Design a protein around this ligand. Sequence first.
Ligand SMILES: Cn1cc(-c2cc(S(C)(=O)=O)ccc2OCC2CC2)c2ccccc2c1=O
Length: 127
Amino acid sequence: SMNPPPPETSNPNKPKRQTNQLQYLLRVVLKTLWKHQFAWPFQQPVDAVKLNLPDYYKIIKTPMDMGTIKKRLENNYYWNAQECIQDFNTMFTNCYIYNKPGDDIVLMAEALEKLFLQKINELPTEE
Ligand SMILES: Cn1cc(-c2cc(S(C)(=O)=O)ccc2OCC2CC2)c2ccccc2c1=O
């Protein structure tokens, strides 16, 4: 029923980099998905109390959302692009796991994931 603490966005002992691929993930990938008309359900951690989803965190044990990804990118939380790409994929997969096929939220995730895949296909080579 209750909400868990959110995923971490700050860890001073975690080594960090600012690479051109990570810059692309913020400037192109995150920005493109964030401005999309279907972004709103994914811009913050799922609030299972407000949405009356008492079983959400019984089912979803690796929660992820673009609000967290945005903070991670802006705070240079990552070492490499694969870490961030994994966070996006976790977000999409959680939606498909928890929800039923054809639900509005699933159609929304699918539209964002299509754009995500298009942008990742053009991920620049590491400088
Ligand atoms: C990822 N995700 C996100 C939402 C969700 C979360 C929030 S909020 C600010 O409270 O966090 C607000 C709206 C939301 O959905 C709206 C779309 C369905 C029209 C959601 C809601 C019900 C069931 C599953 C999910 C889910 O799987």
